[PDB]
């Protein structure tokens, strides 16, 4: 794959997907929005207190 | 109507994109 | 395919160890001559592909 | 003006030094060493030198920019094929700037031994033009003889210029037919650009190839109007490529700068300048003959006879040579080059020179008919023809009129008889007579092949006398028209969709529509999708949508493949932008 950004290898692997029906049509914006948040590390832990697992929603929240 | 396709898997003008480059021998680091 | 062969192989060569009532020391170390026997296996073949790089006859043999 | 290196910025633990590379160097894989008082070589890395049109003292340096984005920077091309009345563009993807193409250009240039000379582009596209001819003598088949309507789709079906040269050098892929030579100039300009030369292919329609500097062509027909046996040694071709080199000639006389076409020969190749082609300066480089006699040369045709004697006949004049075209700078329309090549008909400088060239090489009908046809045929359809006669005679006369249809590749090779007709005429007191006549799909006696042009020849006999009247026409072959909806602006990371169209105008349904989409910059390789059988009378139209990543100027071309017709392929561009800050 020639990309050099995160946006554009999330965009065709998203696609990829699309194409070979792994996923819904309907289900593309959600998992690229959160294919595209920030990456944090180990240094910024102390400065949120502690993180615990998550999931997604269709509704954002 | 205007209607949208099905994929069609063919691997028929695939040798099309093998590169002969010599890709080497790397190291790795893996962080999950 | 080739991935899908390479993960077949890598599946060949592992082993599981059932929970043996055995000291852990004992048990732990029993594997070594086992191990190096699967991993002799695995790396008998190595083969990729033939020296293909070009088919030139160069007008001068 | 010679290598050297001055340090720019200097840091307590830091250095930047720059670099400079003299104006006229030996391109190839290069290695930097270094040398301190004591220690011995120490290597630093590895570099690689190339042309460039960017520099005033260089050979090869074009003062505009946009003709430098053009012939060197772009990788999205267009090829004009078809007859000279019908020109159909096709795209084509020269990949220059692929990851193995300098590799291997390199690599096959290795194979000259005359490392000196690497420091000039003459030598260079010489070489590699010889080296690319034996290599497509070397690796291109025969097309076969058995008919494959099934697979037809899998072997004229191209995918670029990388393909090919990765099959010649290292015959791992699919190889190329008979049917599509032309490729030489591609793969040819792919590699030029690929090592800086600037290089554009050019299309010359109705060129007389095969004899070698001679003005004369010999043609013999059938008495029914077709052409029996196969092939001969000089014949006119429907079309034929030709790859120019921009650059200057330190070794000719002052005034030959500029565009030159590379011909080799069937190997030794070489480069000549066109001015010389234009003027006529035979003398100047052994191949102006031959590309001179291919541009403006006569044919005569020979109408042979069941007793075996070959017979003269008054011909109208076809015009061999016209209508050299290539692509427009800056656009995607098609520009006419032929005044760099030919001066106007019907002029004194042309005759001048005609006679000039003829003087050089000396030291070493009562009635008449003209054709009528459209410039194309839509595909299982049909279309009208006429014929008219007109005498010249105190007396009537009776004539025998007879018309052929008949299959032809693109460099004069028959392919397939498909029509013939014949009957009788009677004119009296120098009246003219006009004949119409329909063509159609249904009467042929089988169907013509997959890439091939129609040839139609009219022959009138007359009863009394034994001259006869020949003419003869070529058309083409027109398959329904595809569109493509889409907007002419796009942003970065955003969804973009695009609409493709398709009328049924054949009189059988489709099956097995198959469609595919691809294009640099927009999506990662080729797509492929299916579709349901479309009756003569309603319409297909799909959607698709994809995301661009890439910034600038990029297009998507879409191919279309049935049981009816093969590989019917278009393209579109399209311009993209940053997103806003």
Redesign the interface.
Same mark, same amino acid.
């Given at each position: 794959l020639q990309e050099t950004s995160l946006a554009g290898v999330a965009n065709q692997l998203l696609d990829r997907f699309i194409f070979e029906d792994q996923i819904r049509p309907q289900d593309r914006e959600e998992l690229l929005r959160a294919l595209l948040l920030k990456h944090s590390h180990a240094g910024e832990l102390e400065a949120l207190g502690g993180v615990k697992p998550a999931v997604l929603t269709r509704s954002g929240d | 109507q205007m209607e949208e396709p099905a994929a069609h898997d063919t691997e028929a003008t695939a040798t099309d994109y093998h590169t002969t480059s010599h890709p080497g021998t790397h190291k790795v680091y893996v962080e999950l | 395919g080739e991935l899908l062969h390479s993960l077949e192989g890598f599946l060949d060569c592992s082993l599981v160890l059932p929970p043996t009532d055995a000291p852990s020391e004992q048990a732990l170390l029993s594997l070594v001559p086992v191990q190096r026997e699967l991993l002799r296996r695995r790396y008998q073949s190595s083969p990729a592909k033939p020296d293909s790089s070009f088919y030139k006859g160069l007008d001068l043999n | 003006k010679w290598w050297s290196a001055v340090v720019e910025e200097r840091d307590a633990q830091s250095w930047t030094i720059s670099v400079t590379t003299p104006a006229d160097a030996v391109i190839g894989h290069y290695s930097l060493l270094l040398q301190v008082s004591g220690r011995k070589q120490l290597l630093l890395g590895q570099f690689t030198l190339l042309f460039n049109p960017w520099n005033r003292e260089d050979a090869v340096f074009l003062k505009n920019e946009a003709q430098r984005m053009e012939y060197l920077l772009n990788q999205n091309g267009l090829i004009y094929l078809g007859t000279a009345d019908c020109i159909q563009a096709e795209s084509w993807d020269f990949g220059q700037f692929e990851?193995?193409v300098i590799?291997?250009s390199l690599?096959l240039l290795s194979?000259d031994k005359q490392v000196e000379k690497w420091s000039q582009p003459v030598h260079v596209a010489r070489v590699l033009g010889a080296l690319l001819h034996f290599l497509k003598e070397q690796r291109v088949l025969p097309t076969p003889q058995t008919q494959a309507t099934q697979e037809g789709a899998?072997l004229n079906?191209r995918?670029?210029s990388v393909?090919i040269l990765?099959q010649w050098?290292?015959?791992?892929?699919?190889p190329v037919y008979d049917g599509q030579a032309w490729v030489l100039a591609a793969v040819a300009c792919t590699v030029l650009r690929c090592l800086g030369i600037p290089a554009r292919v050019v299309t010359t329609f109705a060129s007389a190839q095969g004899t070698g500097g001679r003005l004369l062509i010999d043609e013999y027909y059938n008495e029914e109007g077709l052409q029996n046996g196969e092939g001969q040694r000089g014949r006119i071709w429907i079309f034929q490529t030709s790859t120019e080199c921009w650059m200057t000639r330190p070794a000719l006389p002052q005034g030959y700068d500029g565009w030159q076409i590379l011909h080799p020969s069937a190997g030794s190749c070489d480069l000549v300048p066109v001015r010389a082609v234009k003027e006529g300066t035979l003398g100047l480089t052994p191949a102006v003959s031959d590309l001179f006699a291919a541009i403006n040369a006569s044919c005569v045709v020979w109408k042979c006879c069941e007793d075996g004697t070959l017979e003269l006949t008054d011909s109208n004049t076809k015009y061999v040579g016209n209508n050299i075209s290539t692509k427009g700078v800056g656009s995607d329309r098609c520009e006419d080059i032929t005044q760099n090549y030919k001066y106007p008909e019907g002029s004194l400088q042309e005759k001048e020179v005609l006679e000039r060239v003829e003087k050089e090489k000396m030291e070493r009908s009562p009635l008449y008919l003209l054709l009528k046809a459209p410039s194309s045929l839509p595909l299982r359809g049909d279309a009208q023809i006429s014929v008219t006669l007109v005498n010249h005679s105190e007396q009537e006369k009776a004539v025998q009129l007879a018309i052929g249809v008949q299959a032809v590749h693109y460099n004069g090779v028959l392919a397939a008889k498909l029509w013939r007709k014949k009957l009788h005429l009677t004119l009296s007191a120098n009246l003219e007579k006009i004949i119409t006549i329909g063509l159609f799909f249904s009467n042929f006696e089988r169907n013509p092949p997959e890439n091939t042009f129609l040839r139609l020849t009219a022959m009138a006999t007359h009863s009394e006398s034994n001259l006869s009247c020949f003419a003869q026409e070529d058309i083409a072959i027109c398959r329904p028209h595809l569109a493509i909806k889409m907007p002419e602006k796009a942003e970065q990371?955003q969804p973009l969709t695009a609409?493709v169209s398709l009328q049924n105008s054949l009189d059988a349904p489709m099956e097995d529509c198959?469609?595919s989409i691809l294009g640099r910059g927009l999506?990662? *390789?080729?797509?492929?999708? *299916?579709?349901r059988s479309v009756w003569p009378e309603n319409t297909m139209?799909?959607?698709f949508q994809?995301?661009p990543?890439?910034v600038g100027l990029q297009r998507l071309t879409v191919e279309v493949d049935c049981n009816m017709f093969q590989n019917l392929t278009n393209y579109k561009s399209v311009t993209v932008v940053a997103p806003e800050l």
């Open positions: - | - | - | 990851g193995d590799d291997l690599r194979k899998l079906k995918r670029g393909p990765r050098l290292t015959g791992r892929g699919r990371y609409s198959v469609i999506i990662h *390789r080729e797509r492929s999708y *299916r579709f139209c799909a959607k994809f995301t990543t890439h």
